């Protein structure tokens, strides 16, 4: 299974990936580029493309769209200023023809932080209810603990 994981910078995309691959919480640098890794979960081998979220790189995601079976969209639940921006990025991503049938999994992340928005709140802000054309799911996660990560891999594998 081919997976594209994106989201704004600092959402926690690489932390998520290497928690999944190494069971370890690594010390990230901003990703100017991608990381690509293969992860085994329950007889599925997920090839995850973690593509950096800062602006220059954001402009490049479209090259990773093609062949994508599922999309992990990571959100920093503690950052309320950038939630609209996330909504804007994700909405036009939903309009992409190469992403047309891909399974849509939102991770509301850093759920560990006291003022993190809830997954329900995030669902309203991102406009997730309005997707009728394909599968979507939202999952509260904490990438450092590992909470919600495998519930994500589970949902994804049931595409």
């Amino acid at each position: 299974m081919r997976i594209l994981m994106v989201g704004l910078d600092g959402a926690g995309k690489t932390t998520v990936l290497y928690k999944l691959k190494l069971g370890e919480v690594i010390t990230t640098i901003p990703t100017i580029g991608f990381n690509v890794e293969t992860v085994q979960y329950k007889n599925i081998s997920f090839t995850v493309w973690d593509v950096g979220g800062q602006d220059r790189i954001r402009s490049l995601w479209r090259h990773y769209y093609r062949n994508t079976e599922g999309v992990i969209f990571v959100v920093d639940s503690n950052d309320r200023s950038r939630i609209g921006e996330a909504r804007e990025v994700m909405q036009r991503m939903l309009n992409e023809d190469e992403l047309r049938n891909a399974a849509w999994l939102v991770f509301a992340n850093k759920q560990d932080l006291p003022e993190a928005m809830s997954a329900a709140e995030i669902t309203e802000k991102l406009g997730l209810h309005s997707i009728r054309n394909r599968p979507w799911f939202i999952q509260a996660t904490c990438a450092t603990s590992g909470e919600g990560l495998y519930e994500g891999l589970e949902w994804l594998s049931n595409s």
């Binding site: 100017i32 991608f34 479209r62 093609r66």
Partner: protein, 91 residues
Amino acid sequence: MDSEPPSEISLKNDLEKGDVKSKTEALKKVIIMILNGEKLPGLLMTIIRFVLPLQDHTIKKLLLVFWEIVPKTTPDGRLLHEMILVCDAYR
């Protein structure tokens, strides 16, 4: 591929295949058809996707090659930006 102007559908297939040699050969086949002067933009997203960050020189060199002879014309996988897919991860 000496000069074969309709072969762009096969090149897309050959461009990502999970085999590095095939990808290199494909990108090479694109170069030779452009230099003669033949069809090339269909491929762009495929071309750009494997190679981008890597320090692995041969594909990078190949992509680097294709950016001095047609970068401006091709726009499927590049479009128009300041830090295009010609140079963003080529920093």
